[PDB]
C-alpha cells in the first residue's frame, strides 16, 4: 500500500529556516516524482514544485523558488523541503504527493497527511481563562447562554468542556484565532434558567503543551 | 500562468442529490484536469484524472467531464462521506495550479441566530485588558454579518471572528465575535453593541449593554 508519512508540526521563528520530511513506502521511491503543495485557510492549494528522486531533478514554481529547496534521501525513501527566510506568510499546511504519468500528463494519486508550519516567536504559554456571565443589567430568559474566553495561549491545541463533560448539549467551542503571535478561542454553553446560577457551571480548558488544566466557574456579576 | 476558477466556493445539497462542481481554466488545458477531495481532517484523496478517468478505489458515482476550458465534477446520489471540499487542478502547463475549491454542505431550513453579548470579565479587567464577546449560535445559512458599535458608531479594529463548521447533527452554523480593547479605552465609553444581520430578517438582531447600568 502506497503511503507518505510526513514530519510533525513545526514552530519556527521568522527569518529562520525549517526542513520537513516525507517518507515513502509501499512503492519504488525512485520511479515516481514527489510534489509539494501549500495550503492556507483562505486560498486553496498552491504547487510549490516537484523533485525526481531518481536523478534529483527539481522544477520550482517561480513564486517559491527563491526560498524553497527540494532534496531526497534515496537510502531512506524520504523527500525533504527546506523553507528559508520564513515570514508569517509561510504559515500553512504543506503536503507531499506522488505523481504518476498518463497520456503525457501527471497527476497526484497519493498524498501525505500534511505538515503544519507556524511562524512565530511565541513560546509555550498557558491560556488565561475568563468567565463570561451575562451583563448585570441583563434580564435572562428560560434559556441562559454562558461563555468562557480562552485567551493568550500557544501552541494549539486546547480542550474545553463544561462541567467535565456532564454538559454536552448546546455547547459551541469555536476554532482559535491569532492575535499578536498568540491564540484565542471561546466556548458557549446554553442551559435552562433553573440550572444556573442555582447550580455550578464550569468550563474546563486543558492545554497539554503547558501541562495546564484550568477549571473556571461562571458566577453572576457584582452589581454596580 | 493558467488560472483555475471554481465559481462556487460553498455549495448546498441534500443527500441523494446530483451535485455538480464546476471549474474553468484561463486557457485550453487539453483535458489535463484532475479532481481532489479534501476532508475536514485535512486528508486529501484523488478522485479523477484526465477529465474523466476514475482513480482506482473511487466509487462510480463520481463522474468527470469537460473540454477546452470548462470542466465539471458530478456526484450522483450524494452520501454523507461525500461532504468535503473539491479542488480541480490543471496539468497542462507549469506551474501547476488549483482552483479555489468547493466545500459542500447540507441543506436545511433557515434559522435565525440566537445572539448573546458579554461584557469583559472582572478577572480580565484586573489584567488591564477588556474583551467583549458576542455569540451567534445555531443559524442557517452560514452567511452572516456581525457589526460592533461603541457609543453608537461602528468599530472594526480589535474585532476577531471565528466560525464553526456545519454541525453534524442539526446542520446549523455558529459564530463568535470578540472586540478587544485596553481597560482604559473600555472605561472611556458606555454602550457596546453587537448587531447581527442575517437573511432571516431585514432588521438586524441587536444585543448591547451599558457600562453605567452595570
Give the domain ranges of chain A: 1-121, 122-221
CB-nearest to B176 from A47, A113, A174 is A174
Per-residue cell: B112:
435565525
Q: How far is A76 from chain B (nearest CA, A)?
A: 24
Instruction: Please name the helix (run of DSSP H) or strand (run of DSSP E) that holds residue A214, with its range, or none.
Output: strand A212-217
Q: Which of B72, B107, B142 is the last residue of a domain?
A: B107
Residue whose grid cell is 454523507: B80
Claim to verify: residue B169 and residue B122 sit in the same structural domain: yes
Q: How far apart are CA B20 and CA B74, in angstroms?
A: 4
Other C-beta atoms closer than 10 Å to the C-beta of A141 total 9
Q: B194 with B175: CB under 8 angstroms?
A: no
Residues of chain A with C-beta less than 8 angstroms from the C-beta of B118: 132-135, 147
- CB B162 to CB A113 under 8 A? no
Give the closest-approach CA distance of A137 to chain B in angstroms. Answer: 6
* Domain span including residue B32: 1-107
Method: X-ray
* One domain for residues B156 and B192: yes
Same domain, B94 and B155: no
Indicate if B94 and B112 belong to the same structural domain. Answer: no
Where does residue B63 rank: exposed (0-12), middle (13-18), buried (19+ CB within 10 A)? middle
Strands B62-67 and B70-75: antiparallel
Out of B46, B116, B163, the one facing A107 most closely (by C-beta) is: B46
Closest CA to A132 of A208, A182, A196: A196
User: Do B121 and B198 sit in the same domain of this protein?
Assistant: yes
Task: Count CB neighbours of B60 within 10 A.
Answer: 7
Contact B49 A109 (CB under 8 A): yes
Distance in angstroms (rounded) separating the CA atoms of residues B65 and B72: 6
Tell whether B38 and B87 lie within a shared domain.
yes
Last residue before each gap in chain A (C to N over 2.5 A):
none
CA-CA distance, A54 to A118, in Å (whole number)?
Answer: 31
Residues B174 and B200 grouped into a single domain? yes
Same domain, B139 and B164: yes
DSSP B144: -
Grid cell 497526484 is found at A108
Question: Interior CA angle at B166 toward B201 and B160, to 5°?
Answer: 75
- Do B197 and B164 lie in a common domain? yes
Check CB contact of A115 with chain B, cutoff 8 Å. Answer: no
Q: Which residues pair with A166 in a beta bridge?
A: none
Q: Are residues B73 and B172 in the same domain?
A: no
User: Can you state the percent helix, strand and coil of chain B, rounding each to 5?
Assistant: 5, 50, 45
Alpha-carbon gap, residue A72 to B131, rounded angstroms: 48
Restricting to B residues 195-214, those with a Cβ less than 8 Å away from any Cβ of A are: 209-210, 213-214
CA distance A44 to B104: 15
Indicate the residue among B58, B84, B107 that finishes a domain.
B107
Among A46, A184, A188, the residue with its CB nearest the CB of B135 is A188
Angstroms from B115 CA to nearest CA on chain A: 9
CATH number at residue B51: 2.60.40.10
Whether residue B60 sits in one domain with residue B37: yes
Do residues A33 and A98 make contact, with C-beta atoms less than 8 angstroms apart? yes
Pick the CATH number of A122-221 from 2.60.40.10, 3.40.50.1820, 2.40.40.20, 3.30.750.24: 2.60.40.10
Q: Does the distance separating the beta carbons of A97 and B96 come in below 8 Å?
A: no
Of B42, B91, B135, the CB nearest to A114: B42
Q: Does B184 touch chain A (CB under 8 A)?
A: no
The domain total for chain B is 2
CA proximity to A51, closest of A76, A79, A27, A78: A79
Q: What's the Cα-to-Cα distance from B130 to each of A148, A153, A158, A180, A202, rounded to whole Å?
A: 14, 17, 22, 16, 21
Of B121, B131, B164, which is closest to A172 when you measure between CB atoms? B164
Flag whether residue B123 sits within 8 Å of chain A, measured between CB atoms: yes
Could you give the C-alpha distances from A178 to A155, B18, B195, in angstroms and in order?
11, 38, 23
Residues B48, B148: one domain? no
Q: Cα–Cα distance between B91 and A104 in angstroms, integer?
A: 9
Contacts of A151 in chain B (CB under 8 A): 124, 131
Q: Give the residue from B107, B128, B155 where a domain finishes.
A: B107
Amino acid at each position: 500500500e502506497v503511503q507518505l508519512q510526513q514530519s510533525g508540526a513545526e514552530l519556527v521563528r521568522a527569518g529562520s529556516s525549517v526542513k520537513m520530511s516525507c517518507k515513502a513506502s509501499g512503492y519504488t521511491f525512485t520511479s515516481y516524482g514527489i510534489n509539494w503543495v501549500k495550503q492556507r485557510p483562505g486560498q486553496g492549494l498552491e504547487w510549490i514544485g516537484y523533485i525526481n528522486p531518481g536523478n534529483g531533478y527539481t522544477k520550482y514554481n517561480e513564486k517559491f523558488k527563491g526560498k524553497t529547496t527540494l532534496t531526497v534521501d534515496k537510502s531512506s525513501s524520504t523527500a525533504y523541503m527546506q523553507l528559508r527566510s520564513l515570514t508569517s506568510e509561510d504559515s500553512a499546511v504543506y503536503f507531499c504527493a506522488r505523481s504518476v504519468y498518463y497520456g503525457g500528463s501527471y497527476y497526484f494519486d497519493y498524498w501525505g497527511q500534511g505538515t503544519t508550519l507556524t511562524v512565530s516567536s511565541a513560546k509555550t504559554t498557558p491560556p488565561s481563562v475568563y468567565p463570561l456571565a451575562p451583563g448585570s443589567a441583563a434580564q435572562t430568559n428560560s434559556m441562559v447562554t454562558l461563555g468562557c474566553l480562552v485567551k493568550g495561549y500557544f501552541p494549539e491545541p486546547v480542550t474545553v468542556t463544561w462541567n467535565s463533560g456532564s454538559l454536552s448539549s448546546g455547547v459551541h467551542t469555536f476554532p482559535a484565532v491569532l492575535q499578536s503571535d498568540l491564540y484565542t478561542l471561546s466556548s458557549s454553553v446554553t442551559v435552562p434558567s433553573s440550572t444556573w446560577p442555582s447550580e455550578t457551571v464550569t468550563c474546563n480548558v486543558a492545554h497539554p503543551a503547558s501541562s495546564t488544566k484550568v477549571d473556571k466557574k461562571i458566577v453572576p456579576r457584582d452589581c454596580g | 500562468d493558467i488560472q483555475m476558477t471554481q465559481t462556487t466556493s460553498s455549495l448546498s445539497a441534500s443527500l441523494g442529490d446530483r451535485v455538480t462542481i464546476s471549474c474553468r481554466a484561463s486557457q485550453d488545458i487539453s483535458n489535463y484536469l484532475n479532481w481532489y477531495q479534501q476532508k475536514p481532517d485535512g486528508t486529501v484523496k484523488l478522485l479523477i484524472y484526465y477529465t474523466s478517468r476514475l482513480h482506482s478505489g473511487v466509487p462510480s458515482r463520481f463522474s468527470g467531464s469537460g473540454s477546452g476550458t470548462d470542466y465539471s465534477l458530478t456526484i450522483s446520489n450524494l452520501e454523507q462521506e461525500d461532504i468535503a471540499t473539491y479542488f480541480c487542478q490543471q496539468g497542462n502547463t507549469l506551474p501547476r495550479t488549483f482552483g479555489g475549491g468547493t466545500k459542500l454542505e447540507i441543506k436545511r431550513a433557515d434559522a435565525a441566530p440566537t445572539v448573546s453579548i458579554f461584557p469583559p470579565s472582572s478577572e480580565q479587567l484586573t489584567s488591564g485588558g477588556a474583551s467583549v464577546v458576542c455569540f451567534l449560535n445555531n443559524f442557517y445559512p452560514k452567511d452572516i454579518n456581525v457589526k460592533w458599535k461603541i457609543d453608537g458608531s461602528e468599530r472594526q479594529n480589535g474585532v476577531l471572528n471565528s466560525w464553526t463548521d456545519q454541525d453534524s447533527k442539526d446542520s446549523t452554523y455558529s459564530m463568535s465575535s470578540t472586540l478587544t480593547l485596553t481597560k482604559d479605552e473600555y472605561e472611556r465609553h458606555n454602550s457596546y453593541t453587537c448587531e447581527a444581520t442575517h437573511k432571516t430578517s431585514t432588521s438586524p438582531i441587536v444585543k448591547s449593554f451599558n457600562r453605567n447600568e452595570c
